[PDB]
Design an enzyme around this catalytic site. Structure first.
Site, PDB file in Angstrom:
ATOM      1  CG  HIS A  43      -0.294   0.153   2.552  1.00 47.38           C
ATOM      2  ND1 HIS A  43       0.098  -0.856   3.402  1.00 47.38           N
ATOM      3  CD2 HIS A  43      -0.345   1.366   3.195  1.00 47.38           C
ATOM      4  CE1 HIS A  43       0.454  -0.523   4.412  1.00 47.38           C
ATOM      5  NE2 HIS A  43       0.172   0.698   4.507  1.00 47.38           N
ATOM      6  CG  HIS A  79       0.333   4.505   4.924  1.00 49.71           C
ATOM      7  ND1 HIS A  79      -0.553   4.084   5.598  1.00 49.71           N
ATOM      8  CD2 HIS A  79      -0.242   5.459   4.194  1.00 49.71           C
ATOM      9  CE1 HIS A  79      -1.805   4.615   5.541  1.00 49.71           C
ATOM     10  NE2 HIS A  79      -1.625   5.522   4.940  1.00 49.71           N
ATOM     11  CG  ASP A 107       4.593   1.365   6.518  1.00 51.67           C
ATOM     12  OD1 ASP A 107       3.793   1.891   6.063  1.00 51.67           O
ATOM     13  OD2 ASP A 107       4.151   0.451   7.376  1.00 51.67           O
ATOM     14  CG  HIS A 136      -3.441  -0.523   7.376  1.00 53.22           C
ATOM     15  ND1 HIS A 136      -3.285   0.034   8.864  1.00 53.22           N
ATOM     16  CD2 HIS A 136      -2.435   0.257   6.622  1.00 53.22           C
ATOM     17  CE1 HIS A 136      -2.079   0.897   8.754  1.00 53.22           C
ATOM     18  NE2 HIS A 136      -1.767   0.973   7.410  1.00 53.22           N
ATOM     19  CG  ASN A 157      -1.128   5.457  11.881  1.00 47.49           C
ATOM     20  OD1 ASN A 157      -2.399   6.113  11.702  1.00 47.49           O
ATOM     21  ND2 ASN A 157      -0.092   6.358  12.089  1.00 47.49           N
TER      22      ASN A 157
HETATM   23  C1  YUH Z   1       3.902   5.120   8.209  1.00 46.43           C
HETATM   24  C2  YUH Z   1       2.830   4.567   8.844  1.00 46.43           C
HETATM   25  C3  YUH Z   1       3.026   4.402  10.271  1.00 46.43           C
HETATM   26  C4  YUH Z   1       3.885   5.279  11.060  1.00 46.43           C
HETATM   27  C5  YUH Z   1       4.024   4.906  12.440  1.00 46.43           C
HETATM   28  C6  YUH Z   1       3.204   3.980  13.076  1.00 46.43           C
HETATM   29  C7  YUH Z   1       2.429   2.821  12.206  1.00 46.43           C
HETATM   30  C8  YUH Z   1       1.837   1.856  12.547  1.00 46.43           C
HETATM   31  C9  YUH Z   1       1.576   1.322  14.027  1.00 46.43           C
HETATM   32  C10 YUH Z   1       1.865  -0.158  14.038  1.00 46.43           C
HETATM   33  C11 YUH Z   1       1.741  -0.641  15.374  1.00 46.43           C
HETATM   34  C12 YUH Z   1       1.557   0.275  16.291  1.00 46.43           C
HETATM   35  O1  YUH Z   1       1.301  -0.278  17.494  1.00 46.43           O
HETATM   36  N1  YUH Z   1       1.435   1.491  16.130  1.00 46.43           N
HETATM   37  C13 YUH Z   1       1.554   1.926  14.972  1.00 46.43           C
HETATM   38  C14 YUH Z   1       1.264   1.373  11.484  1.00 46.43           C
HETATM   39  C15 YUH Z   1       0.227   0.195  11.186  1.00 46.43           C
HETATM   40  O2  YUH Z   1      -0.597  -0.104  11.946  1.00 46.43           O
HETATM   41  O3  YUH Z   1       0.408  -0.654  10.083  1.00 46.43           O
HETATM   42  N2  YUH Z   1       1.632   2.243  10.446  1.00 46.43           N
HETATM   43  C16 YUH Z   1       2.379   3.320  11.084  1.00 46.43           C
HETATM   44  N3  YUH Z   1       1.427   5.369   8.487  1.00 46.43           N
HETATM   45  C17 YUH Z   1       1.456   6.959   8.671  1.00 46.43           C
HETATM   46  C18 YUH Z   1      -0.050   7.151   8.352  1.00 46.43           C
HETATM   47  C19 YUH Z   1      -0.169   7.917   7.127  1.00 46.43           C
HETATM   48  C20 YUH Z   1      -0.816   9.033   7.742  1.00 46.43           C
HETATM   49  C21 YUH Z   1      -0.771  10.350   7.346  1.00 46.43           C
HETATM   50  N4  YUH Z   1      -1.718  11.395   7.945  1.00 46.43           N
HETATM   51  C22 YUH Z   1      -0.319   8.306   9.224  1.00 46.43           C
HETATM   52  O4  YUH Z   1      -0.699   6.188   8.450  1.00 46.43           O
HETATM   53  C23 YUH Z   1       0.137   4.884   8.603  1.00 46.43           C
HETATM   54  O5  YUH Z   1       0.004   3.714   8.616  1.00 46.43           O
HETATM   55 ZN    ZN Z   2       2.009  -0.371   8.550  1.00 48.47          ZN
HETATM   56 ZN    ZN Z   3      -0.020   1.947   6.499  1.00 49.84          ZN
END
Ligand code: YUH
Ligand code: ZN
Ligand code: ZN
Length: 232
Positions: free
Chosen positions: A85, A87, A89, A150, A181
């Site tokens: 996807h 994002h 990561d 997600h 997230n």
């Molecule tokens: C890069 C990614 C990201 C960043 C930091 C933490 C996570 C986690 C996560 C994982 C375990 C947990 O325990 N906590 C948090 C996941 C996840 O669940 O895949 N993704 C993260 N982003 C950024 C964003 C774009 C939006 C911009 N407005 C915010 O939405 C996302 O999914």
């Molecule tokens: Zn993620």
């Molecule tokens: Zn993501």
């Protein structure tokens, strides 16, 4: 020393690989986001004498370290990459991959969302995945669009040779107490999308989340539970 790596065993700016099955590895890296440190997973699948990469290591420098770790540990060339996807990561590091000669792929929906949001953009569009339940073959894996979860574009990956289900960030680890997230998630559709995964890959032996420890099929039901409860 054998256990699945966490942020505590990965040196700074480093990547570790973990053998999942014959010709299947996960890669684990660490990144900071909004002042907190997180691990994240991707996949490596042997493609004859080449390698297929699933997802970046969350950042240009991490993904350069990923390529170096692959050459050290495996020694076969990464020729293609799929981002599951839009994002950071998943696509952060695509520019590094592309400059290294790796052909980068994602669905048109992922490419649109990456471009709109200012994230790095895979080069090639993966057609045939725009309706929930769609599946297409890509080298040694099957790509599956389960529906919105997600994110609206999230793809999952199955390695039929090893019955390995890479759920991406649509699937959470068993220790998960939260839905992660959810900024771009569809909490209402997520359980239905997980149900599609469950129905389509009932023989999965290993299930890999987008972040955290792999396990068995229990990760799918657990993910549904945590998401339904988060919404409640
Ligand atoms: C890069 C990614 C990201 C960043 C930091 C933490 C996570 C986690 C996560 C994982 C375990 C947990 O325990 N906590 C948090 C996941 C996840 O669940 O895949 N993704 C993260 N982003 C950024 C964003 C774009 C939006 C911009 N407005 C915010 O939405 C996302 O999914
Ligand atoms: Zn993620
Ligand atoms: Zn993501």
């Amino acid at each position: 020393s054998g256990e699945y790596p966490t942020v505590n065993e990965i040196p700074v700016g480093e990547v570790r690989l973990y053998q999942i099955a014959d010709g299947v590895w996960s890669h684990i890296a660490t990144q900071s986001f909004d002042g907190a440190v997180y691990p994240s997973n991707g996949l490596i699948v042997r493609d004859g004498d080449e390698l297929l990469l699933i997802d970046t290591a969350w950042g240009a420098k991490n993904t350069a370290a990923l390529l170096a770790e692959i050459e050290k540990q495996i020694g076969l060339p990464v020729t293609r990459a799929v981002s599951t996807h839009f994002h950071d990561d998943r696509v952060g590091g695509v520019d590094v991959l592309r400059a290294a000669g790796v052909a980068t792929y994602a669905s048109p929906s992922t490419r649109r969302l990456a471009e709109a949001e200012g994230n790095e953009i895979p080069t090639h569009s993966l057609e045939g995945l725009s309706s929930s339940g769609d599946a297409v073959r890509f080298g040694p894996v099957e790509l599956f669009y389960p529906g919105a979860a997600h994110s609206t574009d999230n793809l999952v990956v199955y390695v039929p040779s090893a019955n390995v289900l890479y759920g991406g960030c649509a699937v959470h680890e068993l220790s998960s107490t939260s839905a992660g997230n959810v900024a771009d998630a569809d909490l209402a559709e997520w359980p239905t999308s997980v149900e599609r995964i469950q129905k389509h890959y009932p023989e999965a032996e290993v299930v890999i989340p987008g972040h955290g420890l792999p396990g068995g099929l229990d990760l799918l039901q657990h993910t549904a539970n945590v998401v339904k409860a988060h919404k409640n």
